[PDB]
Amino acid sequence: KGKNIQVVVRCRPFNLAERKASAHSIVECDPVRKEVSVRTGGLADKSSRKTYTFDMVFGASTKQIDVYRSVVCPILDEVIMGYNCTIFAYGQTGTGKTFTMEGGIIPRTLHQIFEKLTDNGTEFSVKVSLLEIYNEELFDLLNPSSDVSERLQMFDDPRNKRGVIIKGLEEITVHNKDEVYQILEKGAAKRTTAATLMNAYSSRSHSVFSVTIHMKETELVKIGKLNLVDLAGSENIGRSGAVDKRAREAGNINQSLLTLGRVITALVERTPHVPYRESKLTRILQDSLGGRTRTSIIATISPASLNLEETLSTLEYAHRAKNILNKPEVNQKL
Amino acid sequence: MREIVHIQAGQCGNQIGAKFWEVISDEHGIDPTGSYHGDSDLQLERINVYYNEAAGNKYVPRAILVDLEPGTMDSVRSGPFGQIFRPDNFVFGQSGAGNNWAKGHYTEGAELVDSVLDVVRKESESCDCLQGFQLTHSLGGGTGSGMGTLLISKIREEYPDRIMNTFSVVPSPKVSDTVVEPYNATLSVHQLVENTDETYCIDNEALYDICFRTLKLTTPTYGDLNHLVSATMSGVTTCLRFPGQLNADLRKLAVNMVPFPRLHFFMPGFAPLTSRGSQQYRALTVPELTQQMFDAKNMMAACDPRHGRYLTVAAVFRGRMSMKEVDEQMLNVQNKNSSYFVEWIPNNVKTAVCDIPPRGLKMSATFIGNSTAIQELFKRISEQFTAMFRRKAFLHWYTGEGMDEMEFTEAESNMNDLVSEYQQYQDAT
Amino acid sequence: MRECISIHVGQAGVQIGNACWELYCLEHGIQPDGQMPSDKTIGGGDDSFNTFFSETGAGKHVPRAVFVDLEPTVIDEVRTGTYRQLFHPEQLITGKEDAANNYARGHYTIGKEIIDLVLDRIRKLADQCTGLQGFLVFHSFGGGTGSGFTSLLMERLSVDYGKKSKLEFSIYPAPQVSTAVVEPYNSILTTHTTLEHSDCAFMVDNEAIYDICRRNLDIERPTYTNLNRLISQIVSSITASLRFDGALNVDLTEFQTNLVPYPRIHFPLATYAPVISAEKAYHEQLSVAEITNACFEPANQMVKCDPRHGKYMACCLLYRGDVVPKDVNAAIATIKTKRSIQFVDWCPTGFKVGINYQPPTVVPGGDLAKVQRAVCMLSNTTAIAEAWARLDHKFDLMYAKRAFVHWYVGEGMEEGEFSEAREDMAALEKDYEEVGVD
Ligand SMILES: Nc1nc2c(ncn2[C@@H]2O[C@H](COP(=O)(O)CP(=O)(O)OP(=O)(O)O)[C@@H](O)[C@H]2O)c(=O)[nH]1
Ligand SMILES: Nc1nc2c(ncn2[C@@H]2O[C@H](COP(=O)(O)CP(=O)(O)OP(=O)(O)O)[C@@H](O)[C@H]2O)c(=O)[nH]1
Ligand SMILES: O=C1CCc2cc(-c3ccc(C(F)(F)F)cc3)ccc2N1
Ligand SMILES: [Mg+2]
């Protein structure tokens, strides 16, 4: 059941780096269409095109706020219902993982969350967490109080097999927006991963930011949870010419991105075994995968012809995401 | 170079690893002085890389002595070629696991670090890079498991770069001395499996049965079987280290073996596989080795080869083979069973020929593949553990061990998840 | 005269080249020491001589060759060998870390370190030497080393030299079997990109050649060395023509340019005839017709192909031993009259072929008996493309499996590149078909 997992594609305005690249926008975004078309060339020159039709499609032009509004606001209501929701950002840094996170998205969100809840008037508490997944290890950003790595182990809580429990991380509740920001600023610093040669900044680690909201009204008690996941991406080591350690780390993740290719081919498969446990990320994710959790994916792509692989890889993943059946259920609790 | 540290631990491995190292040393043919008795340069260099040269050109074996109890090492040292190892090289905790995976695990570790660090430092210094490390112990028995659990994580942890294979005897599903005994193993192994890139295990029972049956001896001797096992290992080391007309690097083979790295481990196979009388009396024809390998009997572990599926099978021939022989062997495999061959990838098997035929028989081969049945069987054992869990015997001791129940549950759980895949292996051809 | 250097990649590359070189030494009669007790090389440094080695020291001949290997193993053998004494250590290099048969991994990891030395080493020789008409490349498709190495090599060499011709003698996995799962991944991935850079690429029918040679041998199995032996000898014949004028000597490359109407067709398939086993050599004295006819038969064809299926846009003939063009003509009439070989409409003319004065070159300890004449032919067929496809499919299956993505992923190689290989293969096949059609 659940609504199908929602997938939107965003094509970045040609990155300045792209411009230095003199990358050319093969990519065409027809937002009316919600079509995105890529000059593959096929074998042929990229007269040849590959065209996809998307749940939502944003050209470079698409303004950030708009995106959010269209994607976040509906999620926020689900959180207030008790939904568990997750939004994952994929694709190129140029495409604006960084463009998206630098600005909101996060700072904007906590303000709105309190505003909607308090207008709701529900008695509520808000707790946040921020961790980074680096080389298959967990590190607490959110609480500098907590360690650089939050004490991280995960077990099954029997209620949901997919449902898991991450012992030791603490979200600290604050009724006010303000307290959250103070954490927010703190968290960010911890969050930051390694910069890259190619990009000023890169996400070495996948970042998972989670906001849990406890709501009580006269008595019905609901709990809403939102996970904002920012992909960590690798570049070809060979291209990078990065130090071996750097290459290695990139390779690990990159390889992991194949393993993420693989599990998602399984979800499409509806194959008996879904390799959630092969990554900490997909295990944590695990209950969300077409799961009860209401999930949305924002795939960012570069018009640049230069990176064939990422364009092709984002196109394959968009197909593979739809296939898995997302059963968001409002996790409304009384 | 690229020496690998050899580890013997667990009492089993206290024998077994020791046997392996010693036999390998025998393979060295280096005199007990540690100088190289063997005329052969080729062996000498390869061994020599393996064994740091003491003055007097002694060969310093790459091994650590771990004692369940200190006597065990003593027996080892009192055992032959004590001299070759410098006593400095090894140290062992007196305590040992105590045949408790957890209990040993917790207790051992403190000792473990001290011992490991010194040796590891030396070893790290010793070669520019080690291919990896080999562990010998019995998981099924409490210490192999207990030590292994603690050791493996850190040891692996130290170099993610290094690729390590572990050896442990798996408890015979047929019988256990105690129910608890495999219990210690199970947690260890379960934790171990993810931890260690490669595990090589043979069920004790099958090995004993096969060894015994083949032997037609009253029983297989522990040592002898260990010797057999060590022999199995030795060929791999020898062949790879040694030049070969076709030699495959460990990396390529290893990566190759798993269709992708996800597949955690493959189960060992030995060739030639023959009965004691049969093999000893009989000489292998070129096809001969393959056939033995092919049959169920070949697998050290007991499995029905149909029941199992082979992700891949690899054999290392030792010595030269005729190309035609290459053809014949390869051809047979595909022909023999569709399912046996992996449908997906042709040329499932890859073989390398050792440049030099092994000491003794000219041709040697190894078996690679997994036994579906065997893995499944093992999981069943965990189920037995589960049943035991209903008993909830020795929960307290476990408590003393300090391991949580959840680890137990999960340990089974992960295994359960994996095991189904195991069947899947068979399901796929 | 001109000197050539050969490059060996992978164990296979070295071994094969090794066969080549020693043959050269023997054929010259230059002692393996490198300074022949025999008199100095023919015509002093003959063109053949110079390519094979140079006389310096003076009074020493040192071969022009570079041996590269990721894995120390094969190269160390060289060091062992007597030939090693001939080869000054500069020429021979070994690599610590083997490819481990990852094209990408071996290529990236190994290549970076290796290249600088090799390029320098080659460079110095290149500078010193007058130059090569071209150089030969050896490597293994299957071998990771060849795969990774070649890819790195191809771009760099191409970029730097530009004009200098490149030829690659590569081992094409026999459709019968692949040693490794990796090999299909390696081969396809490596091959396609590199090939485009390369003027032409050569692949071997391990199965076809091995079967054919072995069967010709009527021997249970040829030695690998023996198998190499065939390769070397043919090559030597090739060298001989250019090096020393035959009845007709042609610029091999220049002729080759004629031979391949298209850069699109990197290389015509080449054959050597008569197909001579030791026994085959024994059995008959080849005649112009006989050799040609023998050559035509697929048995001759090292590659397993239906020559009928492919068209012959054109073929080349090499001649060895005494020959008279009249005989050639007689062969010509025979061939021309014979329907069986199909000529593409495009090329009305068989021409051209060349003849060598000297009897065919042989690899030392040559298994096969000498043949009066040696010939080589180039043909372009769709079928040859098909063989590539044949391998491709398995690779495709592998890609369908998407197995072992991770290893490449560690490399950072992409599925897309592979897909590109496949697509490129498809396009290439299409091209081959298009050209193939008369
Ligand atoms: N194949 C062999 N199996 C053995 C041998 N000795 C013991 N075993 C098996 O190994 C298991 C016992 O493990 P160990 O010998 O290593 C005892 P360990 O030092 O690890 O721990 P403790 O129980 O604290 O002594 C059990 O399943 C035995 O059947 C041997 O020489 N060969
Ligand atoms: N032309 C020849 N090919 C050979 C010979 N022996 C093996 N081969 C083929 O070579 C291929 C293996 O390649 P290599 O041995 O060169 C391996 P390489 O060094 O490139 O990489 P790795 O060994 O994986 O590190 C495989 O297809 C074999 O069938 C030979 O004597 N001649
Ligand atoms: O079977 C397949 C084909 C490849 C694939 C690639 C991805 C991916 C790889 C890389 C990126 C990124 F780096 F561009 F972000 C994004 C998605 C996800 C799923 C799949 N499934
Ligand atoms: Mg013991």
Numbering used by the authors:
A (entry chain K): 15 to 117, 134 to 248, 254 to 369
B (entry chain B): 1 to 429
C (entry chain A): 1 to 438
Pull text from the paper.
We imaged the HsK5-MT-GSK-1 complex using cryoelectron microscopy (cryo-EM), calculated its 3D structure to an overall resolution of 3.8 Å, and used this to build an atomic model of the complex. The structure reveals that GSK-1 stabilizes the microtubule binding surface of the motor in an ATP-like conformation, while destabilizing regions of the motor around the empty nucleotide binding pocket. Density corresponding to GSK-1 is located between helix-α4 and helix-α6 in the motor domain at its interface with the microtubule. Strikingly, however, the nucleotide binding site itself is empty in the HsK5-GSK-1 structure, and while density corresponding to switch I in loop9 is clear, only discontinuous density is seen around the nucleotide binding site including very little density corresponding to the P loop being visible (dotted oval). Next, using the docking prediction information in combination with the difference density, we applied a two-stage consensus docking protocol, and identified 17 conformations for GSK-1 between helix-α4 and -α6. These conformations were analyzed individually and two alternative conformations—one each from AutoDock Vina and from GOLD Chemscore—were found to fit equally well, with cross-correlation coefficients of 0.62 (conformation 1) and 0.57 (conformation 2) with the difference map density and 0.82 (1) and 0.80 (2) with the full map density. However, the computational docking approaches described in the previous paragraph provide validation of these poses: they are essentially rotated by approximately 180° with respect to each other in the binding site—the trifluoromethyl moiety is directed toward the P loop in conformation 1 and toward the junction of helix-α4 and -α6 in conformation 2. Conformation 1 is most similar to previous predictions of GSK-1 binding (Luo et al., 2007), although our structure suggests that GSK-1 is positioned further toward the P loop in the MT-bound state of HsK5. Interestingly, PLIP (Salentin et al., 2015) predicted an additional interaction between GSK-1 in conformation 1 and α-tubulin-Arg402, which has been previously indicated in motor-tubulin interactions (Cao et al., 2014, Uchimura et al., 2015).
Kinesins are ATP-dependent motors that move along microtubules (MTs), organize them, and modify their dynamics. Kinesin-5s are important for the assembly and maintenance of spindle bipolarity. They are dumbbell-shaped tetramers with pairs of motor domains at either end.
